[PDB]
Amino acid sequence: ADTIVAVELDTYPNTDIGDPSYPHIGIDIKSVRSKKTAKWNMQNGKVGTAHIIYNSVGKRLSAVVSYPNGDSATVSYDVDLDNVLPEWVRVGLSASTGLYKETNTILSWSFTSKLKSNSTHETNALHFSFNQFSKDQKDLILQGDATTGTDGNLELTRVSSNGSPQGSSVGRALFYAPVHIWESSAVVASFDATFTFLIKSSDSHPADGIAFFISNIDSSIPSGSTGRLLGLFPDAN
Numbered sequence: 001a002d003t004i005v006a007v008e009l010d011t012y013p014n015t016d017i018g019d020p021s022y023p024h025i026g027i028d029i030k031s032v033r034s035k036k037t038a039k040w041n042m043q044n045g046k047v048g049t050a051h052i053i054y055n056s057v058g059k060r061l062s063a064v065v066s067y068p069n070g071d072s073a074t075v076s077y078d079v080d081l082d083n084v085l086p087e088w089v090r091v092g093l094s095a096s097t098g099l100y101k102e103t104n105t106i107l108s109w110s111f112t113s114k115l116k117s118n119s120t121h122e123t124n125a126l127h128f129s130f131n132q133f134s135k136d137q138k139d140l141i142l143q144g145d146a147t148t149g150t151d152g153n154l155e156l157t158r159v160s161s162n163g164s165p166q167g168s169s170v171g172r173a174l175f176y177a178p179v180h181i182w183e184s185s186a187v188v189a190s191f192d193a194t195f196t197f198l199i200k201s202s203d204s205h206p207a208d209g210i211a212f213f214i215s216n217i218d219s220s221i222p223s224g225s226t227g228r229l230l231g232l233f234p235d236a237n
């Protein structure tokens, strides 16, 4: 298959596949069944901010998701990503809807990765930030239903003209350039990502969520990965 490391903002409890009974954030290492989760209050129609942070020294993948009123949830998981991810990856955002739906609107996304080594701050680095997306965002690989629009946003999943999110949708956006996420001779490999998002739904139980993910460079939406699989995984194993 792909190799996926992800931080999921999971809006819809799929308890039959190990989701906690409440919306949650989670750290997913090669499985949709998060290695760690934290209860998350998704604030319908509010703009949230997710931060993901890791460095190869601490070997701890951390995420926090917050809303302007100060509510937040955080999850951290100890993992040496050198032993999980390929050396070269692509980084992306994914989202899905299913029977129930929600907008999976990304308003901004930044990412920074650095590899530092042996001597001085002699280093390879990648940093990108999108605080606006354009209709033809050539440095994004859009997959599935993901679109960017003149409205400055990245709609990961289908939204109708009337602004209504659609079910059975899956979409991703990957940064165009592969990222050298680790290297054997790198003394420190660190990355951080931030994205802001607006999940809004008229469904009493919106679904399915948004994820920041890191994958093999040729990662594509696995078949049948709408709904609970968040566009990341081919199955719920």
Ligand SMILES: CO[C@H]1O[C@H](CO)[C@@H](O)[C@H](O)[C@@H]1O[C@H]1O[C@H](CO)[C@@H](O)[C@H](O)[C@@H]1O
Binding pocket: 012, 014, 097, 098, 099, 100, 101, 167, 168, 169, 207, 208, 226, 227, 228, 229
């Ligand atoms: C009830 O289970 C479906 O919906 C939830 C909420 O969206 C998903 O988490 C779950 O994966 C299921 O989605 C599948 O089935 C939906 C129809 O029942 C379909 O719309 C989805 O695209 C997906 O196949």
Ligand SMILES: [Ca+2]
Binding pocket: 010, 011, 012, 013, 014, 019, 208, 209, 228
């Ligand atoms: Ca879920």
Ligand SMILES: [Mn+2]
Binding pocket: 008, 010, 019, 020, 024, 026, 032, 034
């Ligand atoms: Mn989950």
